[PDB]
């Protein structure tokens, strides 16, 4: 089952390789192995983000 998560708050990337998203955005999970930095896809973009900025959606 393809897992998703929804953005709780906006997240403006500080370093390269980080996924930018607005609150309410639904992100697709690629990697959830590291408890802090998860990797996902948002349309065209792909990158890591703070897990404490999202919660499950689907």
């Amino acid at each position: 089952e393809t897992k998703f998560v929804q953005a709780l708050f906006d997240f403006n990337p500080q370093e390269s390789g980080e996924l930018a998203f607005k609150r309410g955005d639904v992100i697709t999970l690629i990697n959830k192995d590291d408890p802090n930095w998860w990797e996902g896809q948002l349309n065209n973009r792909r990158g890591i983000f703070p897990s404490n900025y999202v919660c499950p959606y689907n």
């Binding site: 708050f9 906006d10 997240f11 500080q14 370093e15 802090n36 930095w37 703070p50 404490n52 900025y53």
Partner: peptide, 7 residues
């Protein structure tokens, strides 16, 4: 909005 942890 919680603080972003160690990179």
């Amino acid at each position: 909005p919680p603080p972003v942890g160690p990179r």
